[PDB]
Ligand binder design. Sequence first.
Ligand SMILES: CC(C)(COP(=O)(O)OP(=O)(O)OC[C@H]1O[C@@H](n2cnc3c(N)ncnc32)[C@H](O)[C@H]1OP(=O)(O)O)[C@@H](O)C(=O)NCCC(=O)NCCS
Ligand SMILES: CC(C)(COP(=O)(O)OP(=O)(O)OC[C@H]1O[C@@H](n2cnc3c(N)ncnc32)[C@H](O)[C@H]1OP(=O)(O)O)[C@@H](O)C(=O)NCCC(=O)NCCS
Ligand SMILES: [Cl-]
Ligand SMILES: [Cl-]
Lengths: 180, 180
Amino acid sequence: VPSSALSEVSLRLLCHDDIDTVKHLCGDWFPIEYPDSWYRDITSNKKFFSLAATYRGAIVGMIVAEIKNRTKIHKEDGDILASNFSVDTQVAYILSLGVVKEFRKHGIGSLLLESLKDHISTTAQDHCKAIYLHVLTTNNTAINFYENRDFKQHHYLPYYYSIRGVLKDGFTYVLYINGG
Amino acid sequence: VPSSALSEVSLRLLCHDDIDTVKHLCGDWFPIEYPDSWYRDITSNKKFFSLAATYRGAIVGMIVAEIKNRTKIHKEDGDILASNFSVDTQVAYILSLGVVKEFRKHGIGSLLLESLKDHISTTAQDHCKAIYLHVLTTNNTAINFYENRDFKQHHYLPYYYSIRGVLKDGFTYVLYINGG
Ligand SMILES: CC(C)(COP(=O)(O)OP(=O)(O)OC[C@H]1O[C@@H](n2cnc3c(N)ncnc32)[C@H](O)[C@H]1OP(=O)(O)O)[C@@H](O)C(=O)NCCC(=O)NCCS
Ligand SMILES: CC(C)(COP(=O)(O)OP(=O)(O)OC[C@H]1O[C@@H](n2cnc3c(N)ncnc32)[C@H](O)[C@H]1OP(=O)(O)O)[C@@H](O)C(=O)NCCC(=O)NCCS
Ligand SMILES: [Cl-]
Ligand SMILES: [Cl-]
């Protein structure tokens, strides 16, 4: 992969034709398998903001975000917005950010993140006061990435057990924007 | 297993010597694997009320419950107690109830449940106003068992996905006792 790969990278919305490719990439990047309907959802342009980075026609990275009002923020993360912000105030939750391994450290991840931030800072309907996400405590690469881009650790989420399943521990990271 | 097995069943607290057996039984009954310290905890008689049913010296069943004040109730189940109840008001959460397969339908499960309820209805320190538990939507056997013992469905808990893991959907079931 050429050092100049970034200059020839394009950005576009995901579409239904991408589903198989997305599944494959997500299967490579994340141990948690979401149901098939999630993949349709993010490739539909209705409920999610999903941007792909492409190189010579191939998807080499992607970011998936959900724009939420305060009532759709994870309950354990309700306090990412101070208590004086209106319920209609919105935030962007990063469901997914990934780049094909060989294409990493070329600025693609930063590009996808910047694009999400511009999207929610310039258009009225998706205007947001924060970006937040969850990261496993063991994902040092992602933690450094976000902290170097001025996301702050907002919470530690402890390990959780139930007959319904197990949630690993993790962090809630948050970036305040546009007066957030 | 004889129809009269129940008349010869004894009850006793779990102890540290039971851990290997408990682990083996829990491996058979539940798909979720809890950390080693959980097994130590439930056999330690500190944080949990854990009763075993034994037949001819062998454990054929167990119930594990946690006595909680209002602040320790699962957030999604907080509303099992009306707001007029004292903050110190207690409830019992069933973490675990299981009977060895061939000993099932002999009244052992009911005996364990009855014992839990007497423990929290007669002694002052562990006195409770409710018993609640979680059950997977697919566990018809457990749902019928509890509903036939007048537990009522309090909540549906929907499926949950995150980078931290997956929670299957399920029900919160609740039994009010002692004026609860
Ligand atoms: C986290 C992740 C998305 C970052 O993507 P990325 O494309 O590697 O991101 P970037 O290239 O913009 O930045 C990473 C690093 O490469 C550096 N970099 C960018 N261009 C570079 C270049 N031409 N030469 C040398 N380094 C470069 C960035 O400066 C550096 O980070 P730093 O500024 O904090 O020191 C990626 O490692 C990944 O896909 N992980 C697996 C999926 C995952 O863990 N997702 C969880 C949510 S992030
Ligand atoms: C749910 C469970 C704990 C019930 O244990 P159990 O010992 O079979 O419970 P019981 O024998 O007291 O009662 C069950 C049924 O057998 C019947 N039964 C009891 N004694 C009987 C007898 N001598 N002859 C015929 N039927 C009998 C009960 O009457 C009947 O219940 P019903 O009144 O609702 O019709 C058991 O199936 C189990 O271990 N499941 C796996 C673990 C699990 O799913 N746990 C969920 C909570 S974590
Ligand atoms: Cl992660
Ligand atoms: Cl269950």
